[PDB]
């Protein structure tokens, strides 16, 4: 059939914001705090997202850093899956990447 078992760490998305990155960090926290989520100021432009949609043992934690794209000339929000399986991760991820009113 076909060879699978392929999956390595790498940021991938299609979210593009024309607005300055300084305004993003703001809205971001707004969306998170709204989705009964928990954010933590890690880096200068990074925040630790923590949501317990499912069970406590199956908590989801992803990072949200605002950096400039290499190929594109805009600010894109990269999401790094910290804990939880892919399913769970992509679960809430589909809420932010979208909800993000940018």
From Swiss-Prot:
Residues 44-93 form the KA1 domain. It comes from the Eukaryota. It is found in: Cell membrane; Cell projection, Dendrite; Cytoplasm. Serine/threonine-protein kinase. Involved in the specific phosphorylation of microtubule-associated proteins for MAP2 and MAP4. Phosphorylates the microtubule-associated protein MAPT/TAU. Phosphorylates CDC25C on 'Ser-216'. Regulates localization and activity of some histone deacetylases by mediating phosphorylation of HDAC7, promoting subsequent interaction between HDAC7 and 14-3-3 and export from the nucleus. Regulates localization and activity of MITF by mediating its phosphorylation, promoting subsequent interaction between MITF and 14-3-3 and retention in the cytosol. Belongs to the protein kinase superfamily. CAMK Ser/Thr protein kinase family. SNF1 subfamily. Interacts with MAPT/TAU. Interacts with DLG5 (via coiled-coil domain). Interacts with STK3/MST2 and STK4/MST1 in the presence of DLG5. Interacts with YWHAB, YWHAG, YWHAQ and YWHAZ. Interacts with PKP2 (via N-terminus). Interacts with CDC25C. Interacts with KSR1. This is MAP/microtubule affinity-regulating kinase 3. It comes from Mus musculus (Mouse). The gene is Mark3.
């Amino acid at each position: 059939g076909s060879s699978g078992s392929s999956g390595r760490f790498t940021w991938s998305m299609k979210t593009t914001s024309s607005m300055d990155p300084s305004d993003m960090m703001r809205e971001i926290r707004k969306v998170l705090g709204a989705n009964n989520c928990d954010y933590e100021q890690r880096e200068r432009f990074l925040l630790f997202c923590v949501h317990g949609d499912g069970h406590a043992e199956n908590l989801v934690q992803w990072e949200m850093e605002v950096c400039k794209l290499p190929r594109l000339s805009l600010n894109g929000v990269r999401f790094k899956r910290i804990s939880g399986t892919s399913i769970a991760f992509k679960n809430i991820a589909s809420k932010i990447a979208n909800e993000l009113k940018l």
